[PDB]
């Protein structure tokens, strides 16, 4: 639309019994000419929680403003209630959306199980080489792979899959796949998986020689 | 009261879908219909509304060149048609008045195509591959499991599925759409 709705966290780390807070920044002040200041929230099929900061049948929400900096409390988080929270505007045509804060589940901090594959004969009979390496098991989410051929950073033709929280472990396992053909496969010898994480100061760094 | 739409629509680059939204349970002419998007981790966007009395439709402006709404108070139904459709239309798409559960749409030219899979061989931790595949979804059993959601590439999907054991092993991977099941043994 035109007013951007910035969120943060990205992902909030909450604890089935304690409190929990998260913001929503506006580009431009929601306080409008009649007074009122049109700010909701929704939980995501969709459903709105509150509307210019009043609940309206959920309950247990706050709730506060104002002007262009916006929060929202939950006095005591439960299992519900697990999942994104959107931030709303109507000053202000059109109506935007923030971002999203996703709920998980707090649990402690913990490195990923990183597995380098290279292409299997299989895929380089067919004239493709995929490089594959997984990241398993780690908290939070936030992680950062870089793939890196003969030394050198790759960033062209690398997707990236997370799952979601394990609901037994409360980690995240996620994919990094380097798509090259088979040509230029060949054409290099060492191709590099390096995992930055909050659990170290120092990358994760495995590799294999072709 | 309950806002109907299908679970997933698929269009090929260049050409038009038309999403539908039945309502029941009340009188379709006394809520507006609004449309969302929700690109996979972008935020929803409002595209517009439809007045379903009169027909009168208002559009946020970003949408308006590609979104022609409609009514028909005939059926209770409304209509969002999608033009010129692009790898960034790959979206799921809600009507609301309380909600429709969301239309799942993918663009792709891609006709159904079983999926490639590849081994990803070296507690020791296995994998495979599972490539260029169309449509989802696919099912990957093991013989600590990991299945890693697929991404759209090029009209095409690939996912991966790990495997953790403490040291035979095969991973078996099922494409109803084409009806193929192929199990792969690992070094």
């Known amino acids: 639309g035109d007013v951007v709705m910035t969120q943060t966290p990205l992902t909030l780390s909450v604890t089935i019994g304690q409190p929990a807070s998260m913001s929503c920044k506006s580009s431009q002040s929601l306080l409008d000419r009649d007074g009122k200041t049109y700010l909701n929230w929704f939980f995501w099929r969709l459903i709105y929680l509150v509307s210019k900061l009043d609940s309206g049948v959920p309950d247990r929400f706050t709730g506060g403003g104002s002007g262009t900096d916006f929060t929202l409390k939950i006095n005591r988080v439960e299992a519900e209630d697990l999942g994104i929270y959107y931030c709303w505007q109507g000053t202000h045509f059109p109506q935007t959306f923030g971002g999203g804060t996703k709920l998980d589940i707090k649990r402690a901090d913990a490195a990923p199980t990183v597995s380098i594959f290279p292409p299997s004969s299989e895929q380089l009979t067919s004239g493709g080489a995929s490089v594959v390496c997984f990241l398993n098991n780690f908290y939070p989410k936030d992680i950062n792979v870089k793939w890196k051929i003969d030394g050198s950073e790759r960033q062209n033709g690398v997707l990236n899959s997370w799952t979601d929280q394990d609901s037994k472990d409360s980690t995240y396992s996620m994919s990094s796949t380097l798509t090259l053909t088979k040509d230029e496969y060949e054409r290099h010898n060492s191709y590099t998986c390096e995992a930055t994480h909050k659990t170290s100061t120092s990358p994760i760094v495995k590799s294999f020689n072709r | 009261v309950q806002l109907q739409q299908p679970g997933a629509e698929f269009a090929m680059p260049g050409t038009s879908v038309k999403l539908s939204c039945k309502a029941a349970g009340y009188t379709f002419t006394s809520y507006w219909i609004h449309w969302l998007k929700q690109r996979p981790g972008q935020g929803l966007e409002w595209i517009g509304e439809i007045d379903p009395s009169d027909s009168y439709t208002n559009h946020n402006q970003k949408f308006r060149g590609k979104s022609t709404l409609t009514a028909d108070i005939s059926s209770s139904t409304a209509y969002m048609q999608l033009s010129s459709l692009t790898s960034e239309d790959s979206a799921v798409y809600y009507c609301?008045?309380?909600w429709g559960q969301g239309t799942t749409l993918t663009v792709s030219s891609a006709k159904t195509t079983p999926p490639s899979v590849y081994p990803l061989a070296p507690s020791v931790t296995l994998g495979c591959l599972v490539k260029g595949y169309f449509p989802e979804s696919v099912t990957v059993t093991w013989n600590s499991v990991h299945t890693f959601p697929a991404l759209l590439q090029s009209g095409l999907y690939t996912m991966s599925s790990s495997v953790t054991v403490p040291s035979t092993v095969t991973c078996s991977v099922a494409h109803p759409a084409s009806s193929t099941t192929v199990d792969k043994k690992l070094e």
């Open positions: 609301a008045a309380f």
